[PDB]
Design an enzyme around this catalytic site. Structure first.
Site, short mmCIF file in Angstrom:
data_model
loop_
_atom_site.label_atom_id
_atom_site.label_comp_id
_atom_site.label_asym_id
_atom_site.label_seq_id
_atom_site.Cartn_x
_atom_site.Cartn_y
_atom_site.Cartn_z
N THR C 104 -12.61 -14.38 10.98
CA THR C 104 -13.98 -14.30 11.49
C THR C 104 -13.92 -13.12 12.43
O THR C 104 -14.75 -12.21 12.37
CB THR C 104 -14.39 -15.56 12.31
OG1 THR C 104 -13.41 -15.85 13.31
CG2 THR C 104 -14.58 -16.78 11.41
N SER C 143 -19.80 -15.21 4.38
CA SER C 143 -18.91 -15.98 5.20
C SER C 143 -17.51 -15.40 5.05
O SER C 143 -17.18 -14.82 4.02
CB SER C 143 -18.93 -17.48 4.82
OG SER C 143 -18.56 -17.71 3.48
N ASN C 145 -14.98 -16.78 4.63
CA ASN C 145 -14.48 -17.55 3.49
C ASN C 145 -14.48 -16.76 2.20
O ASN C 145 -13.88 -17.19 1.22
CB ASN C 145 -15.32 -18.81 3.31
CG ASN C 145 -15.96 -19.33 4.62
OD1 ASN C 145 -15.50 -19.02 5.74
ND2 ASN C 145 -17.03 -20.11 4.48
N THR C 190 30.66 0.24 -14.98
CA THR C 190 30.12 -1.11 -14.78
C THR C 190 31.03 -1.94 -13.88
O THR C 190 32.25 -1.85 -13.99
CB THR C 190 29.95 -1.83 -16.13
OG1 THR C 190 31.21 -1.86 -16.82
CG2 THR C 190 28.94 -1.10 -17.00
N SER C 321 29.80 18.96 12.51
CA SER C 321 31.09 19.13 13.21
C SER C 321 31.86 20.10 12.33
O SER C 321 32.08 19.85 11.13
CB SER C 321 31.83 17.79 13.31
OG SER C 321 31.10 16.88 14.13
N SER C 322 32.25 21.23 12.90
CA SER C 322 32.93 22.28 12.16
C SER C 322 34.40 22.08 11.80
O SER C 322 34.78 22.20 10.63
CB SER C 322 32.76 23.59 12.89
OG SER C 322 33.02 23.38 14.26
N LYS C 327 32.89 15.03 6.26
CA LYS C 327 31.68 14.25 6.59
C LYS C 327 30.40 14.87 5.94
O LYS C 327 30.48 15.91 5.28
CB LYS C 327 31.55 14.21 8.12
CG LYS C 327 30.52 13.26 8.69
CD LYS C 327 30.30 13.49 10.19
CE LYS C 327 29.68 14.86 10.50
NZ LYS C 327 28.36 15.05 9.84
#
Ligand SMILES: OC[C@H]1O[C@@H](O)[C@H](O)[C@@H](O)[C@@H]1O
Ligand SMILES: OC[C@H]1O[C@@H](O)[C@H](O)[C@@H](O)[C@@H]1O
Lengths: 460, 413, 459, 459
Positions: C104, C143, C145, C190, C321-322, C327
């Protein structure tokens, strides 16, 4: 069918319960209004005992206060024993795990089955004639709302015990492995990316340390169950259950179980949405997310042979791929991931059950029961499974492992203090350029000597 | 603008911005939600506390230049003092890499704040460098988890209080209605009677035991770290550092900080989080339950089990009074729903561990806080605008125990 | 703080509302009533344009029906036309996404807004003197509803329309990558255990096609939403909305939105929510479940440089990071991993709501609504972030990928016809006891010339 | 017992299987390897039969193209039909429902059982007397990837069918009560407050309007199961089973089962995780929801006598109360809620698993399987349980349900178009003031006549 029976009466007329069947009418009736699953009140963790124990306790307490006859009482505690012993009267609870009424139908079965055992111990004919009427005796000074959950509490709490044993059993299988691989250089993988040298042994105690905490948490969250309820009352205040009785009762209860159970938080709210199960199970779900990931690592650590993190080796249990030798399916952990997932999902049930609490009683407890029980059960075997079938046979592939460490570019760090940081970097890019290793770049740049060079690199 | 140096080239960050390049870049990369670290339940305050604690340590260990170490804790106090230079955390709640982006951001914000408090120009000027000095003897793998555990520990203190207040409302009514008979109902069927007043005391007590649980679990956060592990063991912090640093983290946060069990798995998923979110879920189950009844007990006028008149907050059927829609207990269900759902999110997340580290800490973060917030608010919203305004209906409550079909239970003799 | 305001009054006495503010009485009350979180009805996926359309539509059918005055009807919609557009006057919808009252709160919020906006355009002073009564002229023959769920449905739909589009831009990205890498050989695997040789071009084609069936699944469940209910339920078949109206409104609502709207088959449910929600959110959860997989792969294939699988290189965009280039974080997939678990987590938040049904109305529609929108929205972005900041620039590592097949222990499944299965069954075994490649063991034993071997292997 | 045996051999070794056991080392092995639950492949919904139905269609195509000799092919399909002759040779599937290998263990289980019935009929001995071979023949141009999935759907497609029969057998009892409760008025509540009048008849019909939609969704959702992948891929395309065997065997499956089995709209990732699963179990999750909702309404609309609602009354199942009577516990509506809760719980289990897909193959199908079945089983038995020991002999306390409709001041509404809104208000006020009904108020407060007043209130 129909052959040789006994006609027993109740509020709802007279029905002819299956003679020898220790369960009476109320039960017999339950066996017909509830037909959802094939799983019926049959145990591996406890519950039936959990009930018969809650009765013995209640029984030997009643006789004390002389609430009920010592003549009938010692028959009831004895009766218990004929079910506790070798359960010389066990599995007489044919009611579907799924059942309504918060468990009246369960306290009712326990009562009945016990009522006859006592009677028959007293030499009488069970059933039609009950000189040891269950109601005003076997279940005197109590009601389902209190007798039902306290049985479920002893049970689960005892089921948990069994779960930790298994968990410990599985931990030595991680420890023995750690002690085995204690010095095989593996390089970790944060976000899958490499990280910093480590021993597989260290990888494997991590697991056992991981479960060590699961145990710490389990046996801890399980003590919420200990606060049993026996002698309370449906709604507010209390019927005459309340008296010096209630505490005396559990005082005997703890004398049987052997658990330091104590009188619940108090005597109000109680049964109304008591989610100590949300917590004790919430614990079983934690083991889920954990054990699973523990199985998630092994499956990938033992990934593709001749093409994948070929660090360890899970035991070939199924059939070899002869002509296509490329396989050794991470089978045992998978099935465990399954139980985990199931475990995990059972949470979502119990919660709904707890959320389901309405007014002065939360009936959805039995759904919390089999859901709870289910997880403890599968986890245990999921534990013995991985243990006996998996972790005990894993063995590293030292070579490719150690070689993972010596072929990383992170090991230039260990040279930096000797060749100057700035060269290390130029040694690291080259390594990350030519495809070579810090051990070769260094050796082709003329930075060190093999003897010197190969006088380090073995972890810290 | 100013132009900072970073390996992936020199990005330039708006001069007034106290954060740095990483933070800057991290605002472009991750772009899901509208909400960056909009911390209401402490978080950032926890992050700064962690750095401030690492500084105190670093100093009393000779790790970095006393002045820089002091420049640090100094900046830290400008942030904490009243939650000041806060706002410099523009990273989405949805981010990546151990929430590295949160650690780095804090490092850099504290840098420029610690800098200026030395007369140094903001940003780039690195006499007081963030990584080297503010992040010294620390890594994302360890600082981050800790600011989270502490942040959460405080939001929970505030949580229970809020809950304790709601408790107040119940034990207020409890003693209020006390003198009012009522017919209890188990399985909705009519059990034996009790006083409407006793009904509410159970609500309090329920919550009383809820608290008992939330703290009980929250204390498990106390097992923290600072200067720990990326892999198994872990780099050279393992000197006075860590314990000294947690000793620091203790006296600062005010919370009884303690060095965790051992250096092996922590940032690599923590059952402590699942557990603490668990604690938060159970509370959501009972609070939800409590409100359900509250709606059931204040149902349809005359023709609908009416025992307590709940507050009215919107419209009245003009032509004929016929409603008082339980608008507030409703919104409490809504929250409990959002909280329980998160226990799945925290589940998935706290299960996706990748060998030696859980990369999903942030999502458990956004879920934890989010759920702590609305709940904390929930308890109050129910308190002020609902239970504090609940009035019985005596004749009706008692009416049920009098026309009690089975009155004879005690009237046997 | 309290800087000049107009006075309004509901059944519950009087209150003061910010003059400027178009959100009248109710809404003002509503704002306070619920203090759950910041996010108010700030729906980017179009919840407002939903409610506004529901009102624009409904109004037209009330003019055609001639219930309310043409002149006031013309304003309900004349105003609507405004609020829509880029999303004009629609700012005054300020109530916490968590809000009881079954909607409402929001149904009225819109009722009012359109009245005042309509009054401003009516020259009228708006406020207290409502010449377009939020109820007696806007909220006509309606409404919550029915209006609230309609707007919701209508909204979620358009929001889903956006999702698929986004998802397809992701599909297009995976496509071009299937086209690039198509000639790279990689050993499919798999259960993590090696399976057999495939092109890393195909794996990406698996991605697009996965999503392809995923989109179709979305727009599938989607159109179910179009089955709405305008002006009816509050118990059963509906109140006195009958005749042309209800079916005619949903009809005109189709002339607004642009959606093949159809009135619901019956009209005795919806009030107590609908399974459509769990359904559509099902498609959302499924989508999330599938995107997770893709990212866990994306991550898995980039896993550790020189010490992981190392097949695809997720484009670098963060750290650096050298000294140790060991990474390069899979950060963008990671974030999508995170938007999934949340969307997956919203499947409970919706579920628990739908279940919470009581008699003839499920009062928790709004917590389904927001959870809905959160899911449908975060996911969508989750797509573009992956596309744009990750997959659109992945590179693979051929020599490595191809070196996974060319060196796999069971590639002799095609030399058997030439070396005789029996012979192969021992080569692929001599390999395992050596680490040697198939070629090598083949070539050493001399069962096949390098030529009649280097002139055979790909596929 | 362990009373007799026979020695079979596999790649690993020789383990003597029982003389009555039609399974081979594998099943025997896969029996030991995994042991989590006390639920081996019992299979009450279908599974096994759907699995034999696939192995059979497979042959009907292998016979044809001749991948295997007509005779043995006939021995195979003859073996199939013996199993399906009423569900005869069913008990020969003892491996657990929880199992790794992603179905390698169920796949072989079937392969052997049919292999043995086969040669045995042929006149050959049970045991390694392979004149039919499970692998080489029964599993020709097959693999776990396509046999287990395709079959699993089949066994579930047929099962959900037995569900729509349940939910319909239920719908019938419901509307049975609709046609009965016709002239039974009441007050439809919204947000639990007394809203507007109606007849309890529609109430029960509402429940059905509810269930019928579930059925529709389920009918739609089941469709997805039909897209089978028999005779397909391996990694990212298709090994050599692809040719004509591929869409032929699917035609054979369609035939041997009746269901319109169509092949994958493509061919890849389906085995690596098909989302049709997340969508089906989700439909079951929806079912358990709205159903459980209804159950919960049943427990409400019947609540405690003269101290609860007490509109309708439930059947007495449990031995009642002796001393102080005043109860009629919803013992059954209770249970239905409990099962619903499991389904919903079986939904996260299906999600988590659906998330656990890795690269070219998902291995958590088995749990999605044991999760799908558990749900279809208890849901079917719930509907029949509910329908049989409860909603088949429900009653109504007409007077109190009419006590409620005639009670709430609401009724003023219709007398309003007659007495005038202004007069309609006093009436609403007076009743509010007094505590009288619109009857007595409109009565003494001379407005309408007894006849007039009773001349309308039935709707
Ligand atoms: O069964 C009770 C206990 O008995 C002890 O002897 C065993 O060591 C435990 O494993 C067991 O739990
Ligand atoms: O215009 C290109 C697209 O790029 C995306 O990143 C934005 O989020 C979209 O809103 C936009 O339409």
């Amino acid at each position: 069918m129909s052959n040789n029976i006994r006609i027993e009466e109740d509020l709802l007329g007279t029905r002819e319960v299956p003679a020898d069947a220790y369960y009476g009418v109320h039960t017999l009736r339950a066996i017909e209004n509830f037909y959802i699953s094939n799983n019926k009140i049959s145990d591996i963790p406890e519950f039936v005992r959990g009930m018969v124990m809650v009765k013995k306790a209640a029984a030997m307490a009643n006789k004390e206060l002389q609430t009920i006859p010592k003549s009938v009482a010692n028959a009831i505690i004895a009766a218990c024993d004929e079910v506790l012993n070798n359960g010389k009267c066990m599995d007489q609870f044919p009611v579907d795990v799924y059942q309504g009424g918060a468990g009246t139908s369960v306290n009712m079965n326990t009562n009945e089955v016990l009522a006859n055992i006592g009677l028959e111990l007293m030499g009488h004919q069970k059933g039609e004639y009950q000189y040891l009427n269950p109601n005003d005796h076997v279940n005197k000074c109590q009601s389902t709302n209190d007798a039902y959950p306290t049985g479920f509490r002893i049970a689960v709490y005892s089921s948990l015990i069994k779960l930790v044993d298994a968990i410990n059993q599985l931990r030595e299988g991680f420890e023995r492995k750690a002690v085995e691989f204690q010095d095989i250089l593996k390089m970790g993988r944060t976000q899958l990316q490499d990280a910093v040298p480590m021993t597989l042994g260290q990888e494997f105690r991590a697991f056992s340390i991981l479960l060590k905490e699961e145990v710490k948490n389990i046996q801890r969250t399980a003590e919420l169950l200990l606060e049993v309820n026996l002698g309370a009352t449906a709604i507010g205040t209390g019927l005459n259950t309340p008296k010096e009785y209630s505490p005396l009762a559990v005082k005997k209860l703890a004398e049987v179980t052997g658990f330091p159970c104590v009188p619940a938080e108090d005597l109000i709210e109680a049964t109304s949405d008591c989610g100590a199960y949300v917590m004790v199970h919430g614990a079983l779900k934690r083991l889920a997310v954990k054990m699973s990931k523990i199985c998630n690592d092994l499956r990938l650590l033992s990934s593709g042979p001749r093409a994948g993190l070929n660090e360890i080796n899970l035991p070939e249990l199924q059939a070899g791929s002869s002509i296509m030798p490329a396989k050794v399916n991470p089978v045992v952990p998978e099935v465990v991931n399954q139980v985990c997932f199931k475990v995990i999902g059972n949470d979502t049930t119990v919660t709904m059950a707890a959320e389901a609490g309405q007014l002065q009683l939360n009936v959805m407890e039995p759904v919390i029961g089999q859901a709870m029980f289910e997880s403890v059960h599968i986890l245990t075997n999921a534990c013995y499974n991985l243990l006996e079938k998996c972790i005990n046979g894993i063995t590293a592939n030292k070579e490719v492992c150690e070689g993972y460490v010596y072929n990383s570019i992170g090991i230039v760090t260990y040279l930096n203090p000797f060749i100057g940081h700035h060269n290390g970097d130029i040694v690291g890019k080259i390594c990350a350029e030519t495809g070579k290793s810090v051990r070769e770049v260094v050796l082709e740049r003329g930075l060190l000597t093999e003897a010197e060079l190969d006088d380090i690199f073995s972890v810290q």
